Amino acid sequence: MRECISIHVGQAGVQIGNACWELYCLEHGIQPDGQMPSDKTIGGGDDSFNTFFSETGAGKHVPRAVFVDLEPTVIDEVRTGTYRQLFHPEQLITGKEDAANNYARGHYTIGKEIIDLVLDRIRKLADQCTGLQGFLVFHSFGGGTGSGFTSLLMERLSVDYGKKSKLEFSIYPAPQVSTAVVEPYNSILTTHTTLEHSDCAFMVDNEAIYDICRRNLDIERPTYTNLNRLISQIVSSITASLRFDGALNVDLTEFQTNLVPYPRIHFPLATYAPVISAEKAYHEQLSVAEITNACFEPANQMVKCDPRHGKYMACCLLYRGDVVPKDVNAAIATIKTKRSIQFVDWCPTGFKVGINYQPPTVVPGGDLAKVQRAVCMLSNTTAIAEAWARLDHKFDLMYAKRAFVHWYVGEGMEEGEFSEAREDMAALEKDYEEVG
Amino acid sequence: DLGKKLLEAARAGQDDEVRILMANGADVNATDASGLTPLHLAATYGHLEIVEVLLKHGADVNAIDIMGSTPLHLAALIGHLEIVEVLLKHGADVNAVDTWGDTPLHLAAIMGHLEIVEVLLKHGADVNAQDKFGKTAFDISIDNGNEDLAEILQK
Amino acid sequence: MREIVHIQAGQCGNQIGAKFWEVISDEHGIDPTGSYHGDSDLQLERINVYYNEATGNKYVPRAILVDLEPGTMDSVRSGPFGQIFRPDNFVFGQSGAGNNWAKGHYTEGAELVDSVLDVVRKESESCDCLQGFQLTHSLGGGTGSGMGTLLISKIREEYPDRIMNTFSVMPSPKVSDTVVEPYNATLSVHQLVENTDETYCIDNEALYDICFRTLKLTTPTYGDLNHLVSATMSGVTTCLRFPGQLNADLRKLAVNMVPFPRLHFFMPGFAPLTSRGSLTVPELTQQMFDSKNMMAACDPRHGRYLTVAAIFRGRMSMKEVDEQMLNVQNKNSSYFVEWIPNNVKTAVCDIPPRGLKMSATFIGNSTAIQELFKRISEQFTAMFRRKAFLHWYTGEGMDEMEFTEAESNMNDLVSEYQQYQDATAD
Ligand SMILES: Nc1nc2c(ncn2[C@@H]2O[C@H](COP(=O)(O)OP(=O)(O)OP(=O)(O)O)[C@@H](O)[C@H]2O)c(=O)[nH]1
Ligand SMILES: Nc1nc2c(ncn2[C@@H]2O[C@H](COP(=O)(O)OP(=O)(O)OP(=O)(O)O)[C@@H](O)[C@H]2O)c(=O)[nH]1
Numbered sequence A: 001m002r003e004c005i006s007i008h009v010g011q012a013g014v015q016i017g018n019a020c021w022e023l024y025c026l027e028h029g030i031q032p033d034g035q036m037p038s039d040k041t042i043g044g045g046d047d048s049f050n051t052f053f054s055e056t057g058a059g060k061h062v063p064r065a066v067f068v069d070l071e072p073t074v075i076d077e078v079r080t081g082t083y084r085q086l087f088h089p090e091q092l093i094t095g096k097e098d099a100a101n102n103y104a105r106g107h108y109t110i111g112k113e114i115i116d117l118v119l120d121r122i123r124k125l126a127d128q129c130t131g132l133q134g135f136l137v138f139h140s141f142g143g144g145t146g147s148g149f150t151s152l153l154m155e156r157l158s159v160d161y162g163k164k165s166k167l168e169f170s171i172y173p174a175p176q177v178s179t180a181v182v183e184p185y186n187s188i189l190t191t192h193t194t195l196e197h198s199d200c201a202f203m204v205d206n207e208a209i210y211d212i213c214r215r216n217l218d219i220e221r222p223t224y225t226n227l228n229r230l231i232s233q234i235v236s237s238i239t240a241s242l243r244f245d246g247a248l249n250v251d252l253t254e255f256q257t258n259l260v261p262y263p264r265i266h267f268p269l270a271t272y273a274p275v276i277s278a279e280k281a282y283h284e285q286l287s288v289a290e291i292t293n294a295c296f297e298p299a300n301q302m303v304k305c306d307p308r309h310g311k312y313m314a315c316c317l318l319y320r321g322d323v324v325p326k327d328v329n330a331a332i333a334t335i336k337t338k339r340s341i342q343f344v345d346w347c348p349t350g351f352k353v354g355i356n357y358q359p360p361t362v363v364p365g366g367d368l369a370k371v372q373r374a375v376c377m378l379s380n381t382t383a384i385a386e387a388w389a390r391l392d393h394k395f396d397l398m399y400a401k402r403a404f405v406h407w408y409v410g411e412g413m414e415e416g417e418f419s420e421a422r423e424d425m426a427a428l429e430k431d432y433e434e435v436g
Numbered sequence B: 001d002l003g004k005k006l007l008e009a010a011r012a013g014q015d016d017e018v019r020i021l022m023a024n025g026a027d028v029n030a031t032d033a034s035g036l037t038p039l040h041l042a043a044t045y046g047h048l049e050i051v052e053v054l055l056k057h058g059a060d061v062n063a064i065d066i067m068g069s070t071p072l073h074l075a076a077l078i079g080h081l082e083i084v085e086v087l088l089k090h091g092a093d094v095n096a097v098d099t100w101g102d103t104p105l106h107l108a109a110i111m112g113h114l115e116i117v118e119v120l121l122k123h124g125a126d127v128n129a130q131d132k133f134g135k136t137a138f139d140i141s142i143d144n145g146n147e148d149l150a151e152i153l154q155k
Numbered sequence C: 001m002r003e004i005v006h007i008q009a010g011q012c013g014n015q016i017g018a019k020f021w022e023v024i025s026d027e028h029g030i031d032p033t034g035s036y037h038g039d040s041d042l043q044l045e046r047i048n049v050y051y052n053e054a055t056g057n058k059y060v061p062r063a064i065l066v067d068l069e070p071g072t073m074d075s076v077r078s079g080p081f082g083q084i085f086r087p088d089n090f091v092f093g094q095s096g097a098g099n100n101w102a103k104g105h106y107t108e109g110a111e112l113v114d115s116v117l118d119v120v121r122k123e124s125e126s127c128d129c130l131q132g133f134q135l136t137h138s139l140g141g142g143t144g145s146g147m148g149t150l151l152i153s154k155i156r157e158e159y160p161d162r163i164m165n166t167f168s169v170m171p172s173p174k175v176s177d178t179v180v181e182p183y184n185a186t187l188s189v190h191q192l193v194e195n196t197d198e199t200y201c202i203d204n205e206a207l208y209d210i211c212f213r214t215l216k217l218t219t220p221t222y223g224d225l226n227h228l229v230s231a232t233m234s235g236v237t238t239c240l241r242f243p244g245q246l247n248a249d250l251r252k253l254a255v256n257m258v259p260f261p262r263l264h265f266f267m268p269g270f271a272p273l274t275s276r277g278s279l280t281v282p283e284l285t286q287q288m289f290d291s292k293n294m295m296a297a298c299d300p301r302h303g304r305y306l307t308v309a310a311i312f313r314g315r316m317s318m319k320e321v322d323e324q325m326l327n328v329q330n331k332n333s334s335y336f337v338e339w340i341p342n343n344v345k346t347a348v349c350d351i352p353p354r355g356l357k358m359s360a361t362f363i364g365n366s367t368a369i370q371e372l373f374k375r376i377s378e379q380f381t382a383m384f385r386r387k388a389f390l391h392w393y394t395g396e397g398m399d400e401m402e403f404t405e406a407e408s409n410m411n412d413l414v415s416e417y418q419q420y421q422d423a424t425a426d
């Protein structure tokens, strides 16, 4: 057993973190006060769930998690909510004044006032670990804190924890539920400064999640509560291999080995199926072939892009529930007889499969129906370059006129940092073109 | 030199002092360094009684300063309606043009003195007179969206 | 980001300032003595943004009242909410400024400025996390214009990292035919381009035109004009005073609305327009973007929107608002710059203003605002070319070059708006 520490930064990171930890508790049988009756070893243990939860002498199972925000309103909802007794009170860190949607305030001026306290509190959790493997960092690209403070934090974690893995869950901006006009700037600046310091990053496109809520869940106008519940189900499916027994993606290093062929092209695409409305409680149960085929439909993707226009470098299928391995083999064999799936000529043309035989858990109050079998596909495809091109184009439209740049330069940032970040994104776009 | 004292009395509105200075031979048409006369100053600072008395004592109603301003241009710019009427009754040239190509109509229109615009139009102000940039008083009203002024200039 | 310190200077500044406090006190359930008589918790959630909590559960405005004329203090005190203000927060001089900007900025105004700054310091030290300042004033007089801009620069020196916002009333000969007002306004605009982060332009020309042509009031009074100003000020401060989906503050407004530092002059708008004593979502979105509903006498269809913030108040479908706002942007696509993506932001607040079930407030950063600056510039130049009444200013120590510098800076501002009006994406 090797421990994982989760860090939730800014509003989006904190709200998604709250939804994830609620779901983890329901999956593991942990009550809101931290008690876990099924855990026979009181005060300690080496079980797979201990990768995410420590244990106290009184039988309390505490998340190995830190929540940080530069203003207190969002974290105050965690401090007074249903799971207020679950977290380490010193694990919930707040400043008084936020980054005002400005990367430079998050990174250089406001962020510097709390960075040392956050690192000292992370060290307290790290000191409790026997074999820390690394960190899971949750944050928006668009927010000033999610963009700027996260980049500063990832820079410091690389110096203080050199050999440890760092994985991100990043929220990619959408016009439908955006906060700021400058989100494309914050997104490019954080991507450039974090690229070296992150080993693998799962982007979540808010437009993709918004469309899934509208089309599959019949939610006319999805709110963050609806988006976050669906995101938490996908994040749970991705982290399940670290918290339960299994043979695929059992540690953070294996995520890199399986999904990241080269350091810079470290952005896998997630696809999840089936997503069925809770109002359809008597829905027909979909077979392994049906849910597997649905992974290759662009409508079920976590990022809007078309994998038919790209090439695959890796593909992992993670099943949960009543899934017979021979049915997976037969469904994959059918999938290989389809012109739309092309692998690069230098990777083995194969699929890695993991099965957890417990079906997914649904949260009370959620929008999803219970299902007997579900799948999350993680792939590294060159089609994800389409998401970077869309973001780079919005950056270029404003940057050509230097619109809003004075706000960043006024908060300790050099104008040349914008050109350096954009040049790195042009190189990243060419890295995908050179693979295919 | 009583001309310099008459210029100060006309600006300050000292009615009795104007009468004493003229009775002692002060030059009613004295000029300051920029070519302004006692009548220009009384019309700028709104001293109606001084304007009337200077006109009964040989003041040139159409005197121009170094920039071509007549007393009517200054009364129309500052918005002294009663002074505009007295100057017009005493022969002021309604279409006098200064070094910027402005007429009294242009200045009354720019400053929004609509009652003075009406009086000038009734006394034959030329709606086609162009300033040095080609603008008439109607062009000024259209360019600044002053519908009240555009309505008066179309009557 | 919570507390705002409000300052009101001069006659106009104190008149519109007092009406602002009357209108927002009624929305938050605060009575003239400072007691809360409301029936909703959403009224008290962000009350500390504008009010201090005194002993006895009394809410006192965080407001400083300034004037060189003592008489203004009497009119404020005699008003309905005149006793709610802190008596120590009234800072008044002996003799006014006589509509002379130089007296407000360099002589009478400079003598009283340290007293005002003492009161500003005491209100600021009493804040948990001060966001910045809000000033109400006219630009055509002497105190609000001359002393108001001096106060802005001094507050800017002591609090350089806080936001400075103004509600600045622009002069018009339709409301006050006083020919030195274009001088006072141009001298003030030179100061506001450098020393404020965001300025709401409230134009007396537009207020008169709405009252006369749209509301059919044959002889508009200051009370009629101030009814539109108070409705606008309530609307634009909605997201600072109520929770909503956004945690809005003055800095997030500036970062998202001001792409170039000097272009921080907003054109506010309001729908429905109503007179004292006397709609569907598609009607409100349409009226909100109409020239007849703007509080600056500019036609938005003569320029382009750089950024827009809209606030809808009342009970309505947020899906309907999203669709109608998307529709107005598609049909009016040539009036938005194409190089600032997603430059229109909408907020919906459940609490409507008094006497209305539904309302909409618009805040536009439009290049068409150059029409307002051009109108003032032409009047300033007509007067300045003849050096009319210049001795009234130079006699107070002002240099003639300050007039030339103010004129040149305002003509440069107009050129900067034209530059972005003509720019293309390519
Ligand atoms: N999916 C999802 N997106 C969110 C959530 N909250 C905010 N966002 C997105 O995150 C971006 C805004 O960043 P935030 O995380 O709110 O900002 P922040 O990190 O708190 O930074 P500052 O407030 O600027 O200091 C926008 O693209 C929002 O749509 C959430 O709970 N879920
Ligand atoms: N909308 C509106 N404009 C007003 C009001 N009071 C004055 N004004 C305008 O403000 C300008 C005159 O400035 P005032 O505020 O009266 O002057 P002040 O700031 O007190 O300065 P001094 O009197 O010169 O010391 C003119 O353009 C007036 O039309 C008011 O209540 N509402």
Ligand SMILES: COc1ccc(/N=N\c2cc(OC)c(OC)c(OC)c2)cc1O
Binding pocket: A179, A180, A181, C236, C237, C239, C240, C246, C248, C249, C250, C252, C253, C256, C257, C307, C308, C309, C310, C311, C343, C344, C345, C346, C347, C363
């Ligand atoms: C143009 O886009 C934006 C504009 C402002 C933004 N931030 N904060 C505010 C938003 C407001 O209304 C929507 C507002 O109401 C007036 C407000 O008052 C304080 C602040 C965010 C944006 O993406």
Ligand SMILES: [Ca+2]
Binding pocket: A039, A040, A041, A042, A043, A044, A045, A046, A055
């Ligand atoms: Ca145990």
Ligand SMILES: [Mg+2]
Binding pocket: A010, A011, A071, A098, A143, A145
């Ligand atoms: Mg935030």
Ligand SMILES: [Mg+2]
Binding pocket: C010, C011, C069, C096, C141, C143
């Ligand atoms: Mg006054």
